[model samples]
Target: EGRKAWIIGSGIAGLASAFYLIRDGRMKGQDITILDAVGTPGGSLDGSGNAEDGYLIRGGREMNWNYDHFWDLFQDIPALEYPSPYSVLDEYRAVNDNDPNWSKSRLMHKQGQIRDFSTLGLSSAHQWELIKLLLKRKEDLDDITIEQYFSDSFLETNFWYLWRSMFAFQNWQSLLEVKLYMHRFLDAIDGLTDMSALVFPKYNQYDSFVVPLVNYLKGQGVNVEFGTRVYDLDMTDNNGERTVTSILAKVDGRDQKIDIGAKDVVFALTGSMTEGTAYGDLDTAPDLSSDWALWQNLAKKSHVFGKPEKFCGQPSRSMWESATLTCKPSPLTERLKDLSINDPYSGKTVTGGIITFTDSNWVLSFTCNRQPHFPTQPDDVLVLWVYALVMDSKGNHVLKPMPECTGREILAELCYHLGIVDQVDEVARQTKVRLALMPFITAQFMPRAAGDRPRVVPAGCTNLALLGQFVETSNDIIFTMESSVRTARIGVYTLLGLPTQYDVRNLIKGARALNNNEPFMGERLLHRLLDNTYFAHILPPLP
Candidate 1:
């Protein structure tokens, strides 16, 4: 009756944990505290700035109907802009349905000409290898790179360009993750070409997702301590049992300690994709750093806490650069309209999803999602986000590696690929570019072994649980909102001694409850074969 909860890291996992604790565990909102090192919540799902100063989106999220737990948690929170009884999910469904997303030009080459990406370009050999890879056991694929699993022809196909650009997977990324993605989104195999399978928030994530969530939590009296950096969590161990004893932190640049009550529970989101993110303006490149001290400390105490070094230690492998362009009312807007064949200021879908430049040395991609991406953006202003998968490679036009180039130079590179070489100078003058160099943005996709990531609730932990993308969850893919919410549900339910049904653990029960009694979503998706007729022969023979 006297129990309280402390959740470190006010990202999706931390926010969802608080919601579940109050909603299901019967914990009062006032009894819970959410700690964030920064002034805002939403972690990697971030967007900020104005029409005058320009907008900044470090990254964006790719969501779809497959996010079971994500829908469950979001459906409860009230929509920020919609009328009464319209939950966040309700608003999202309605908005996306009204202005659906599907890319007309998913890949551009030969200076803005649309590449014929109508096929995965898989020969029979590639298809057979894919079938075997999918059937391969998880244990056999651990720490294996995608390059090692697939043929050279497979990596150079239309499928690889589409897959890698859409999901940001490097050649050296985990094949296990690629398998999980293929299995998880099997229902949308045919939809990948037009990107009709994906969904997006009405506005930038901070506006559409995080603000509503933050408002709902605050309305429930949940306290989110901003600028509170949680460095290390103190724990006590006895006979192989571990329990968090206290929290160590810096509140406003001053040291502070919070003693954990014996009845209190703790949930820490270990590691982060955007932990030490740095931003640069038009003239500068973003410097890089990382924050893995807390995780390293926890792992030193117990093996079950996980190996942080496996993910965060190699920044070069997981690093990428994304820039946001704020365009004023200028000819550049007309150029974009002619190039994409979509109106940027029409208040409708634009680009739908990222359009990759297949021939670019940096392998760059860009997107303009229902312009006026920010709530504060002007009607004439258009916001576009562009990122490069190969940071060290020299750009097609900028003549330097993407990480070494300034925001203005990055925009020039994108402009060159868009067939606007002559106008690059004018466009640079008409837009404000903000660059974000994320050292560990794709760290979650790094190749790793089974024990590299900790369990949601360790075997011997009594009052401690780990949440977020780093935790090891079954059949769930990382780098999406669904993973965070799913992990949070498991963490909360495990610590509270709740039954399986209460935690949405059953695929059938969870799907029925959330998906209008449809067949189990996972099984339904997994059972479907690739719609391509050429690959039909390989499906039935898989062991």
Candidate 2:
């Protein structure tokens, strides 16, 4: 029987699922159809605007070498530029290697005064907490928040500031997830001081990554049905065998029911981090509000689907606002240059990574990627993306909560953080600032048990799989671009019952094992602490 595939949501996970099915499972691209509610294909991985109107990117994605599945899939998809012998992976490798990323200013305090965070400023007690968390098994860490796991003092340390800012972790987020992050990126422990462990695309993610992948799928004759929202799936169970019968959705503003064939497969994006995302111009807060209903309804069908409520319940805990700043040939770039260790116009690594404001009320952080983040961006215009962890807190300069502030006000606050308060007027005038308030942006980090996240291929399932951050994949951390793509691989491989040497689980295990071989410096410090000599230079003074 010829099998067909219906992948819901065109986010990175869904898109990657389609690619793997075609590339590895030998499924015909023409036989697969990707359905997304949005008019665009990239989902959260989006970049859209022009020099006149200004560019907007809802969120940012940082690349890492350890993304085995992510690198594997992209290596097959051809690059955006045609007639070249380069895949997206090839181009990415060439670009990143030639111009590596490492931050000059990882954390700033007292208005752009570079804070000395080189030692991580982690006390022995803080180090013990980290070591304990790392040594503890996953089960022990479950249903525990970071705040509960560590002392109040841990939150005040320079390490916590950088760690939380870099990963968008709140004090109330999952301790289990934090443990996973520590283990998953232990290779990056030393590099975290300067963000050298990460990398970025040549252009914004949508243009650089999503565009090429979509183009490749189109070339393969894969049909992507845009503006088609899959509200729910019709499934049936006979004894132990579960199957997706059909899908109910609104296609082009009209209700439509698409039947799933007996042999057809369904890759459903359970919960969306970017669902109900609202946009705001220079005068407006991006409003908040899901695919949450789909997951909730799926959970009602079977326990195997997992609990959506655990992750989606608390919007306040997960909410963080990110804004994109587009400055049109102003002194702002010069001020930006002053803040950056490298020239912003170097056409290489700029800020390298996010610059966290250590003393800011809003816990604000911002970054300037290589210039012309958009393909059609002007030569003189600069694009920078900024976010505030404490969105409800009053800004230092704006005097309003981040979610309530206008784009101009956001620019002023950003200016104040950059220690360029005098240029706020000119910068605000020259810049077109856009705000995005993501209520569920960090939902995956919410504290939860093991079964809270559904398996990639849930139990008693045939022709059904879950993809995205909400799916359970061992040893992987959520919110990273790798997690989505990794889940996609696992979903595809499991659904197809593919017997390949490049098993996703094996790759994950291998990555996990690498941490032990070299070990985290923090973990190493714990062993060396008994000697006392190794820690003499690093000990902090009495409180």
Candidate 3:
């Protein structure tokens, strides 16, 4: 019998699942339908717009190379042809290799000092202890706030500030959740420690990874219906079995319900941002009311789906600020080159510090390393991007900084921190700060407890499954393409009743390098050298 699948949301997870189910599991192309609320397939993996305004804001960061599932999935997709001699991964490797000390490069404050954690009083030993504790607590992974994990006496040390602020930890998230993420990428920690492996996508993540995947999915005959909002599901009880009978959705302007037949349904919907939460005083976040209403309806009748309250304790509102700069050559470029020479954050020691002024504000402040700007961007025009994290703080009195500042205010704060804004005239001359506020950006990563998030298969669901960042998977990091790929593979395998291609259990241990490998040897030597107390003495403090 031919199988059918109905996937909700056209994000990477949903699309990837459709591709695998149809292409590898032999499900008919017509048997699959991908429904998305927005008028795009990328979901968070989004990139659209022109040079005048810069790329439409999506996720600012890129996927890590250690994402095993991501690399495996990319192997099946066709590489973009115009970019000569390099696929996306190849290009990334080349960039990192050329600037061998790229990770160590620092963002400098106006005072010309590199941002170093040591200066902030965070020592190598302190970080090592935290790492050790994190590794030890992996098995008991459960729901716990980030504040709970660091409530011990040691957390009061200066290291906590560096770890929390730099890593963007808030009081809401579970410490266990953060530890699991760290454990998932344990291999990359060495690079993080050496400050050499932190890499960014050539462009925004949506352009570099999401768009390519969407193009590939379309070629596979997948049905991607956008601008359609799902409102509720109608379930039926046959004998004692409960199954989804139909989906009520609003297409264009009309509301309609479609029967599911025998098809499996996958929900890749966003959760937290649907609720109204302000981010740093900016008002441009996504509203998940449609998604929220659906979940609320399901919870009213089913215990298996789990209530929304279980995952994100408080409904989260997303806020991000960014700026786009128009230039032939950025004025900061020469300054970066000069700073790279004496940068204590440079080489294999630390991630450099210094923010860039570009199209967006607070949420993304990255400095571009390659020329010709973005691949699709014109060489004659230079575009720079920058941003900062914003959190919800209505009841909390923590006096959080990100959620309180506007784009211009953030720029002033950054300048003040750098000790460069001595006069109002200098601040006024710093033009080119464009502000974009995404209120629902952090909806996917909102703090949640176990069971609040749905499983691959919801309770009483015989043929329906869920996939995406919101779905739970072992050892997978949220907010990365790898999580989407892993969920897709799982959904496809389960639907077809076939053995999964990748083993989730051995993922971390299997990727480890053999002792004799040159890279491994170098990594070990560097670790040992950095571990030495003498080397710690010379390390610079955080700027």
Candidate 4:
């Protein structure tokens, strides 16, 4: 019997499942079908715009140099542009090696001067809290918010400010997740203020990563059904063997059902970080919908899918607004060229990585992607993407909430923090600013426990698996390009019962290693850098 597979969510996760299923599990691409709800298939890793209407990228994807599985899959994907059969990995590395990620300016203010955030303002007591938290096991840390562990004083520290803006960690986010981030990217802490550990796709992710993968699948004759929402998964239990039996969905504005052969498999991207994301033009508010049509319904059906409520319930906590601007030869890029990645001499043009305002009421931040952020993006057309974590809060200069501000208003706020508000009037009017209000943008980061997010292949469920940032992975963190792709590998390989390709090494040696009697640093982190003596130069001891 020829077996077929159904991969839900045409986002990177679903697309990744299709790729990995074929490559690792011996499933033919022709036998797999990818379903997505949106008219387009990139999910949040999208960039679409023209010079006239500006551009729209739901958000930027900050990749790490060592995103194990994401790069492993890309090493096989044929490069977008090729003379021979060079892979995506080959081309990306070839072009990016010369571009170091260190940021000359991480946080700026009213004066808009690039200042070094050398001091994280870590009090000795705060250091103990860090060490103490590290000492607690993951089990002990579960269901606890980071705020509960630290102080508002610590929250006000430069370290917390940089960490919060950099990783989107709220005081209310999972302490476990934050702990993982701190350990996982300890090497980054020194340069995170300067962006030393970050990596970027050649172009915006949709053009750089999504398009190439999709093109490869299409070349393989993969069945990618766009504009279709996987409404629910139909399951069956025969003699204690529970499996996905069929999938019901609305396809192309109409309902459709796909039966799952006993031998067939289903890869369900259980919850979406970008689901129900609504967009707004310069003058309008981006719509809001925490309504996860896919997971909301899936959770209703089975406990195997895990609790969507825990993740998606509080829109206020998870809600964040992101915006994109497409500019054409405007003064915006003129004076603010410093914002470019590896920004050129007299301001380099490389997407200069993230630029955050540590002193803004909106908690505002943005980055001007390397020029020609899109393939077709004209040389003169400049594209920039920015977002605010405090979406509902009033702005510093403009009292209107971030969600209610127009494109020009957002522009003023962004330029104000850059100390270039005077330079912004002409530019704001000349550029197209599009905003997106993501109600559950950080839903995956919410204070979730082990059981909140289901396993790759849930217990006792045969032929059914989950993928995406929302699905649980041992160490691969969420809200990253890697989590989605890695989950695909885990889901496909485990469900198909295939030998694993590579060891999924935790960034740190182990989760438990961090929870010890040591000071602010963990064993693995100590192994990577720093020693007992280095602490002498560090922050003052806690109260």
Lowest-lDDT window of 10 residues in candidate 3? 508-517
lDDT of 4 at 535: 44
Candidate 3: RMSD to truth: 8.3
Ranking by lDDT: 1, 2, 4, 3
Which 10 consecutive positions of candidate 2 have the poorest summed lDDT?
Answer: 508-517
Of 1 and 4, the candidate ahead on TM-score is 1
After aligning candidate 2 to the native by TM-score, how far in Å is the CA of 21 from where it should be?
A: 1.2
User: By TM-score, highest first, what's the ranking?
Assistant: 2, 1, 4, 3
Model 3 per-residue lDDT tens digits across residues 240-288:
6677888888898798887777655554454534234322212233222
- Write candidate 4's Cα lDDT for 239-291 as tens digits: 76687777888877677888888888888776666656777877767655222
Candidate 2: misplaced stretches above 4 Å? 40-47, 60-66, 286-290, 499-543
TM-score of each candidate structure, all chains considered together = 0.88, 0.89, 0.72, 0.86
| Candidate 3 TM-score over all chains jointly | 0.72
Model 4 whole-model lDDT (C-alpha atoms): 0.70
